Design a protein around this ligand. Structure first.
Ligand SMILES: CC(=O)N[C@@H]1[C@@H](O[C@@H]2O[C@H](CO)[C@H](O)[C@H](O)[C@H]2O)[C@H](O[C@@H]2O[C@@H](C)[C@@H](O)[C@@H](O)[C@@H]2O)[C@@H](CO)O[C@H]1O
Ligand SMILES: CC(=O)N[C@@H]1[C@@H](O[C@@H]2O[C@H](CO)[C@H](O)[C@H](O)[C@H]2O)[C@H](O[C@@H]2O[C@@H](C)[C@@H](O)[C@@H](O)[C@@H]2O)[C@@H](CO)O[C@H]1O
Lengths: 282, 290
């Protein structure tokens, strides 16, 4: 097993199309998350709606159809092949930013302005598991539309967007529980236009996901001990544990944590360790 | 030891636009020379041109809005906001390389958002287009200010009568330190182009070619493998049956070739195959047609 030999700031977010710009721990270190993207086991098994490429993250494709009030999308996979309402929560790569309006910029798969912005609410007709969502748009999209989540905003006036939530979809990756004993889940944060924190967290950089899928490495221990290394001085900046279920922890120093580390370090696999191997605080 | 990504073609990203690869092809003129600045990396992991590491850096722009007596522009930075220094690159890393057309780039202001946060920056590749020196002019129907970060959304012709040719690169300048041209390397070989659907208005097709899938680029950067021959022989393999569907050569300078059958080529291959490194071979190794 290896992890990507790529500095953190050259890694992509796995929940929105953006680069990672810092790490952090949650304000409540017992907080449980259940992100559906950026989920993959160390052996390379994708979970939830997680796709392989950073260019599949938080994208939607579907055929426009007429609903009672306007238009909707009958979803397909991003490659245009049919979506089958089966075991996954939604088509692969479907956004997982819950409890907010989405604004998705799509094109018809040209003359004039080719873009449509689809404004999607997560209310009753939002049924991505079944394969359909509704939208309003100031443009006139028709046919086969492919696009990318552009920004998010509150579901109702006065509400706030919490990008730590996931949608109700109508094989949902399981919750990630802080494993105890002072360890805290490490979240990888990206700037992203959120109207009304304005950073989106994820639990694995996208290139970690493709790395695990590509490598199909056997898991040889209860956790993988990683070092976060300065690529210029080659000094070890901190210890992290990578768990088989596909998330990373550290022991954050009180009043601090991985948010105080440089954002240009490289994670390097060091050794397999037991589940209760104690980390040096960071 | 050199490997290539164990990822099927349809799960690979384009290295010139933010899109997934949906097929391979060869150019209609098989002697056509290209000089793309993104998707460029040697087998030893040396990035060339403006090529970034991540698929989510591809064809993106960041900069600070400034005004002139005549209009507005962006003073470019790198995508992480750090200063862009004109040195040995054509532009900031990840900067689009779709030449000779108007660009339409959707940006947001980095940091307390209210209302519609997006601005569409309309960029012309005329005189004020000087990304190598670190600035471009734009017009916009919105009101972007401050630190704007965004992604190429679509492209359209420079003039009314014109077409978009996504096989061209910009004029970045003046010496701009371009990644060198890629010539078809002889022995009946044709460069393999990886295509993605993308909104090109008034292109002959709505597709953008690139010469390396983006995950190949990051793979080479990570691996930092030594080059041990004049070319790497690859097989394109069906992941279910494990059978070899065709021979390809991967060159040290960072591109892939095949010998296409007359009237055909890799465009006729299934799109769910995986490239696998086979062996190092001589420059003169003659490929079986595909
Ligand atoms: C449909 C539409 O055009 N709505 C505009 C408002 O934005 C909507 O806000 C609601 C919640 O209030 C919801 O997020 C929709 O998805 C938004 O499209 C707009 O409100 C202003 O901008 C919003 C994004 C909101 O977040 C806030 O910034 C502000 O109230 C109003 C005001 O210009 O115009 C509406 O047309
Ligand atoms: C500034 C503007 O919005 N102009 C509209 C034209 O779009 C511009 O076309 C020029 C080239 O003529 C260039 O591509 C700019 O980037 C565009 O913004 C528009 O042209 C029509 O739509 C274009 C996207 C393109 O498909 C063109 O072939 C087509 O004629 C014209 C016509 O609607 O209106 C202009 O106001």
């Amino acid at each position: 097993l290896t992890v990507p030999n790529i500095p953190l700031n050259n890694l992509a977010n796995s929940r929105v199309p953006a680069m990672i710009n810092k790490m952090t721990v949650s304000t409540d270190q017992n907080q449980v998350v259940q992100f559906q993207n950026g989920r993959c086991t160390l052996e390379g098994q994708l979970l939830g709606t997680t796709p392989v490429s950073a260019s599949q993250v938080a994208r939607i494709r579907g055929k426009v159809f007429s609903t009672a009030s306007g238009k909707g999308l009958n979803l397909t996979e991003l490659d245009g092949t049919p979506y089958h309402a089966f075991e996954s929560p939604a088509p692969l790569g479907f956004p997982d930013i819950g409890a907010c309006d989405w604004h998705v910029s799509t094109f018809k798969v040209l003359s004039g302005d080719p873009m449509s912005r689809l404004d999607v609410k997560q209310n009753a007709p939002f049924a991505p598991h079944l394969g359909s969502i509704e939208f309003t748009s100031d443009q006139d999209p028709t046919g086969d539309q492919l696009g990318t989540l552009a920004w998010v905003s509150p579901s109702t006036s006065g509400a706030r967007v919490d990008p730590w939530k996931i949608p109700s979809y109508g094989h949902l990756a399981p919750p990630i529980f802080p494993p105890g004993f002072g360890e805290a889940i490490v979240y990888f944060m990206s700037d992203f236009p959120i109207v009304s924190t304005a950073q989106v967290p994820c639990t694995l950089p996208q290139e970690f996901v493709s790395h695990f899928v590509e490598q199909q490495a056997p898991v040889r221990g209860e956790a993988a001990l990683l070092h976060y290394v300065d690529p210029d001085t080659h000094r070890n900046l901190g210890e992290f544990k990578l768990y088989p279920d596909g998330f990373i922890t550290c022991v954050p120093n009180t009043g601090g944590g991985p948010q105080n580390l440089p954002t240009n370090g490289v994670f390097v696999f060091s050794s397999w360790v037991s589940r209760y191997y104690q980390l040096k605080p960071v």
